[PDB]
Design an enzyme around this catalytic site. Structure first.
Site: not given
Ligand SMILES: Cc1cnc(NC(=O)C2CC2)nc1-c1c[nH]c2c(NC(=O)[C@@H](C)N3CCN(C)CC3)cccc12
Length: 286
Positions: A17, A19-20, A22-25, A44, A135
């Site tokens: 979903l 990516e950064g 060191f970490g990913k979702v 995450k 953030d």
């Molecule tokens: C919980 C959730 C539920 N539902 C959807 N739904 C979807 O994705 C839909 C579109 C398909 N998303 C999330 C979600 C929660 N955090 C996310 C992050 N988080 C980061 O990248 C963090 C690490 N960084 C953000 C930038 N920051 C400067 C540093 C940290 C990326 C992508 C998705 C999520």
């Protein structure tokens, strides 16, 4: 059986979903019955590429989110357990950054201001628990439905100590600088009023439907210089010291723009509160 304990053997990865470094979702299905009927969840976790301090951070994020309960804060589901994963509800519509450009016809000024109120209510809840988010950007605000948004990521969130007005971040790795208040850029100091600054920037994004050409980065980089690399943030500080701010979005009433401007007072102590914003928007809505 613990309902917040998710067994690795049943947590099946569908896709990435976000990516950064060191970490990913990831999008996962939790499928204990093994027939694809299980609930979709956002997971995450830390990348093997990540250092040792990143695990501590993820554990603190988990404990923060575990204890937050609000209509406009994304729902904690549990953990999958040295290494650990954070399990959250999955919102298919994604962030405002993704959702707004594809839904302009559906989302009028009234709905924009209703989202703004919801963001302020989740943020005020977070502030009452002595957390600074650090953030607050449209990309981290999730769309539940056309009528509901939720604050959706707590990766950078920090506790403010009792009888203290700010948290000093020792490592400010990959900060969203174009959403940051002067005290954050200059001194690495994060107040509640620092999130109010960030909210103003997020309000701008919302009002521009997260259009990339008028994004906070784009507009500031036009103001200062697309620089400049290492000198970006110090030049940005200088433009803010001069009194220059992001302009009034197109089709944005001056009344809404004035609420935005009160988020961007140079000094943290003279900024508006989230409660003052809610009252402002609510008076415009009636
Ligand atoms: C919980 C959730 C539920 N539902 C959807 N739904 C979807 O994705 C839909 C579109 C398909 N998303 C999330 C979600 C929660 N955090 C996310 C992050 N988080 C980061 O990248 C963090 C690490 N960084 C953000 C930038 N920051 C400067 C540093 C940290 C990326 C992508 C998705 C999520």
């Amino acid at each position: 059986v613990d309902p917040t304990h998710f067994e690795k053997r049943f947590l099946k990865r569908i896709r990435d979903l976000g990516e950064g470094h060191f970490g990913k979702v990831e999008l996962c299905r939790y499928d204990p019955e093994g027939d694809n009927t299980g609930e979709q969840v956002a997971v995450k976790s830390l990348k093997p590429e990540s250092g040792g301090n990143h695990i501590a951070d993820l554990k603190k994020e988990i404990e923060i989110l575990r204890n937050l309960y609000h209509e406009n804060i994304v729902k904690y589901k549990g953990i999958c357990t040295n290494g650990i994963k954070l399990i959250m509800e999955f919102l298919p519509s994604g962030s405002l950054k993704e959702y707004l450009p594809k839904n302009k016809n559906k989302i009028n000024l009234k709905q924009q201001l209703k989202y703004a109120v919801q963001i302020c209510k989740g943020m005020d809840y977070l502030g009452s628990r002595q957390y600074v988010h650090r953030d607050l950007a449209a990309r981290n605000v999730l769309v539940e439905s056309e009528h509901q948004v939720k604050i959706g990521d707590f990766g950078l969130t920090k506790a403010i100590e009792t009888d203290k007005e700010y948290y000093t971040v020792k490592d400010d790795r990959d900060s969203p600088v174009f959403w940051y208040a002067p005290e954050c850029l200059m001194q690495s100091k994060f107040y509640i009023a620092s999130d109010v600054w960030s909210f103003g920037v997020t309000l701008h994004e919302l009002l521009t439907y997260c259009d990339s050409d008028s994004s906070p980065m784009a507009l500031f980089l036009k103001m200062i210089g697309p620089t400049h690399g290492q000198m970006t943030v110090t030049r940005l500080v200088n433009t803010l010291k001069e009194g220059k701010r992001l302009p009034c979005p197109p089709n944005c009433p001056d009344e809404v723009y004035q609420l935005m401007r009160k988020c961007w007072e140079f000094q943290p102590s003279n900024r508006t509160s989230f409660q003052n914003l809610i009252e402002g928007f609510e008076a415009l809505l009636k």
